[PDB]
């Protein structure tokens, strides 16, 4: 399932790229001869006018052939006869279509609706504070209501998240916080965490103490704690939060546990032994919380705007990553090869539909970006050729053209072997 999913993903991506190249070329009166989809022998070919459409065996890549690209042919439809501006346009047609496809599919997926976690919409209530964290260190008691941070007035958890990420980007350290508890506006000083890298303020929302899943073969599974059921007490201890359940199982450390559960209306006292699991030397129950979300649907204009700025954001992120790797900041092993994208496609196949859309858009934009970096025999190399020819005013020497093509072929082959061995190494781990 994952393999064919990756195959159709790469097929539609290359289809979009070559289709954009094809329309953009057609908009400048050039004849197209070959419309290869992939590589290897043509698995099937159909002819329609000059469009000899065909799909080949190896779906790794995809190639197109025009009429009179570099040959000294003076026919009006010849690509070489066209001015360097038009040649640059044909060069840029493909990745432009890739980017527009990514932005439009992001707009559609945002319009359709995403299952945003429900805890992101209610007003902020601190239902639990992690032990010996920043919130505990300042003195944020559980059950309080945060009302002001710095600034930006905060109402829901989304406002808090945006405020903290904005403060982290601004590089501020101390921030005034106005907290409410029984109606006193306490003023405190909070160290701004670098949430960009991952660390968080250690604030937990109120979560209902209801089980949504149980691991197969877990001791709770052996007892018979089905998913979707609610629990009152642990050995007589009153608990109103699933994080209280987490605290109780953490402090159990292996003692006998008498869970008093409401089996859809009946009281059951189930005995369990969450001893030190040999996998990690810790309490094991194999039980999962009941995650509750809500589907959010965005109108078309706002969905388009959100897709637009999200696209700008992660495109800037990809540009920064490219600059880092070209400067040696990040090791080359983090790139995404065909096997890596195939395995992430399989993970999305196990994930869901919105996963399909989101990571399809992600690989599309990543490939479009890759098709712009200046490399010979790449969608981002003929732009360099046309630019230098236009500014110099004369065509590149034929021997120099052949050497250009040869070194480009060499370097692209080496990079494919490099990504293959990197993917094999990733498969090993």
């Amino acid at each position, epitope marked *: 399932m994952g393999l064919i999913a990756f195959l159709i993903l790469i097929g539609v991506l290359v289809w979009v790229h070559e289709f954009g190249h094809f329309l953009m070329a057609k908009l400048f009166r050039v004849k197209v001869e070959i419309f290869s989809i992939g590589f290897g022998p043509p698995i099937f070919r159909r002819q329609w006018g000059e469009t000899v459409y065909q799909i080949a065996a190896l779906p790794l890549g995809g190639y197109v052939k025009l009429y009179g690209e570099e040959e000294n042919v003076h026919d009006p439809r010849a690509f070489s006869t066209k001015k360097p501006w038009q040649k640059i346009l044909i060069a840029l047609g493909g990745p432009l279509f890739n980017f527009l496809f990514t932005i439009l599919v992001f707009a559609l997926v945002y319009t359709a609706g995403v299952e945003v976690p429900k805890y992101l919409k209610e007003p902020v209530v601190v239902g639990y504070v*992690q032990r*010996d*964290s*920043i919130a*505990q*260190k*300042i*003195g944020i008691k559980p059950g309080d209501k945060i009302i002001k941070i710095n600034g930006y007035e905060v109402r829901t958890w989304e406002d808090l998240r945006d405020a903290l990420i904005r403060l982290s980007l601004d590089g501020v350290k101390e921030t005034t916080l106005f907290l409410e508890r029984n109606g006193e506006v306490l003023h405190l000083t909070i*160290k701004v*965490p*670098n949430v960009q*890298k*991952g*660390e*968080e303020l*250690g604030i937990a929302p109120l979560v209902k103490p209801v089980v949504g899943g149980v691991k197969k073969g877990s001791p709770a599974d052996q007892v018979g704690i089905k998913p979707g059921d609610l629990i009152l007490e642990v050995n007589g201890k009153k608990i109103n939060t699933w994080y209280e359940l987490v605290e109780e199982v953490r402090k159990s450390q292996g003692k006998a546990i008498k869970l008093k559960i409401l089996r859809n209306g009946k009281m059951i006292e189930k005995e369990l032994i969450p001893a030190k699991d040999p996998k*990690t*030397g810790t309490y094991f129950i194999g039980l999962f919380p009941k995650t509750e979300t809500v589907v959010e649907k965005k109108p078309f204009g706002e969905a388009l705007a959100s897709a637009v700025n999200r696209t700008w954001e992660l495109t800037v992120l990809t540009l920064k990553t490219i600059a880092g790797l070209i400067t040696g900041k990040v090791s080359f092993q983090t790139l995404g090869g065909p096997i890596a994208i195939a395995q992430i496609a399989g993970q999305a196949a196990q994930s869901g539909f919105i996963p399909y859309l989101v990571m399809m858009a992600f690989i599309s934009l990543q490939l479009g970006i890759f098709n712009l970096i200046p490399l010979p025999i790449l969608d981002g190399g003929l732009i360099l050729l046309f630019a230098i020819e236009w500014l110099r005013g004369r065509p590149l020497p034929e021997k120099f053209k052949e050497y250009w093509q040869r070194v480009g072929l060499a370097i692209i082959i080496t990079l494919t072997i490099f990504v293959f061995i990197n993917d094999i190494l990733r498969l090993l781990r």
Partner: antibody
Amino acid sequence: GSEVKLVESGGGLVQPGGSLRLSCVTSGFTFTDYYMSWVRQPPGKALEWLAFIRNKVNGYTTEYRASVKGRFTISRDSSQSILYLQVNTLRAEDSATYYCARDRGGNGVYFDYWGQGTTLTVSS
Amino acid sequence: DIVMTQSHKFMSTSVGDRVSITCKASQDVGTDVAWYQQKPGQSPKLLIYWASIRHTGVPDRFTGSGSGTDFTLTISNVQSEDLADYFCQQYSSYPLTFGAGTKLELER
């Protein structure tokens, strides 16, 4: 104003089986707002955390290494920015450099500023 | 309890080179790890916390990385002022434990 500064006192030579109190004088920061600890560094040995004490909003509660619980006691002065450590039943293995340290406020206690340390030698 | 094992007691390097000091935890500690530097006769000094966050004032040459059990502190372009002892520390669970330390030896 003045940068964070910690100065320990009370070290020296003490016979086995005795008792003493080490002191740590702090300056440059609000004393009642930071965790304090008495991590020790034996000669040619790894650092050994001994205890830490929480802030005012957390009731000044203490946490101890299980091996030293009931033997070592950390505490703060009531009206001055001085941290104390009472030690009894001294043995030759307690001979080390004892460091007083101020911790940051991030997630989970780590030690962002260390004092110069004071050396204790326990022998007959 | 949690034991921090530094496999290397000594490590050789030259000025301007890059050194990678490894640190292995007895069990999963996530990212609740800090790193310190101690020069002879001086107190330790925090360089990295949360596995990868550099402290304020720490040069860009010091980088931390790793997750789970095999954390690593990489020092690109070793300067002469980096001859010191470097050790890790975990704060995932109590009691807090430190590594045995790693001394930087110069090649010649």
